[PDB]
């Protein structure tokens, strides 16, 4: 199964690819967590990410590409794989089907995980991740069974830098805008698909799994 998952700040993309990597076990490909991961070690790129992260903006697309070809092509991406969060604009996108056309993996389902953005805010400033493995949590939604604690690796929770309400604000006008574009983009390739995300996680899964049936695992 080759995957997409899209959708604004907050609306659930790693919360939902949490639970399919543990379903299927593909790998989980995250442009945000590889330009968080490069900043925490202090790579030229990561240090340039970090100054669009820390803003809200998008990284420009030809680095963000770069490292999505390199990523794709290795073993594990063999027998399957789901992208979270990329691609986030059209370029990226068209980038994006040249990759999989030359090493034979093209997508199956785009995954568009539908969330309206007046309960982002919410989502996005309550959220705590894992320092360590990068499991989702929310203090109101989805709480960790011992605060502070990763339920998965007994790790510290942390903020992210950028859910603060200011830099939320940011993003979501930033990835708004890139919407419509990308949506129309698979639209017309004819293999978008809706979910809607403002369910229960549990039933936002159900969804995504009814969805992911139809593919081999
Ligand atoms: N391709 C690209 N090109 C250019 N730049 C790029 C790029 N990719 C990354 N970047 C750069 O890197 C930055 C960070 O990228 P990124 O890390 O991808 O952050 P984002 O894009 O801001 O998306 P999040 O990871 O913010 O949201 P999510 O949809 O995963 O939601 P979650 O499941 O956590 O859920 C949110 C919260 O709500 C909770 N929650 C989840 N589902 C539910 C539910 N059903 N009900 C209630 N609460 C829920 C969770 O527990 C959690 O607390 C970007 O801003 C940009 O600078
Ligand atoms: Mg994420
Ligand atoms: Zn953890």
Same mark, same amino acid.
């Given at each position: ?72 092509? +290795?073993?594990?991406? %063999?027998?399957?794989?789901?992208? =979270?969060?990329?691609?986030? &604009? *059209? /370029? ?59 339920? +998965?690796?007994?790790? %510290?929770?942390?903020?992210?830098? =950028?859910?603060?309400?200011? &830099? *939320? /604000? ?48």
């Amino acid at each position: 199964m080759n995957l997409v998952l899209m959708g604004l700040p907050g609306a659930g993309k790693g919360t939902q690819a949490e639970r399919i990597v543990e379903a299927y076990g593909i790998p989980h490909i995250s442009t945000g967590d590889m330009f968080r991961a490069a900043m925490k070690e202090g790579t030229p790129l990561g240090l340039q990410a970090k100054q669009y992260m820390d803003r809200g903006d998008l990284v420009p697309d030809e680095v963000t590409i770069g490292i999505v070809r390199e990523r794709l092509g +290795k073993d594990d991406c %063999e027998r399957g794989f789901l992208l =979270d969060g990329f691609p986030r &604009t *059209v /370029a990226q996108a068209e980038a994006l089907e040249e990759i999989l056309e030359e090493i034979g993996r093209p997508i199956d389902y785009v995954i568009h995980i539908e969330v309206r953005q007046d309960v982002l805010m919410e989502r996005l400033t309550g959220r705590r991740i894992c320092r360590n493995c990068g499991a989702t949590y929310h203090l109101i939604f989805h709480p960790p069974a011992k605060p502070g604690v990763c339920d +998965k690796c007994g790790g %510290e929770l942390y903020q992210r830098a =950028d859910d603060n309400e200011e &830099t *939320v /604000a940011k993003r979501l006008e930033v990835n708004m805008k890139q919407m419509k574009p990308l949506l129309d983009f698979y639209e017309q390739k004819g293999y978008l698909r809706n979910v809607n995300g403002q369910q229960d996680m549990q039933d936002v899964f159900a969804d995504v799994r009814e969805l992911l049936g139809g593919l081999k695992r």
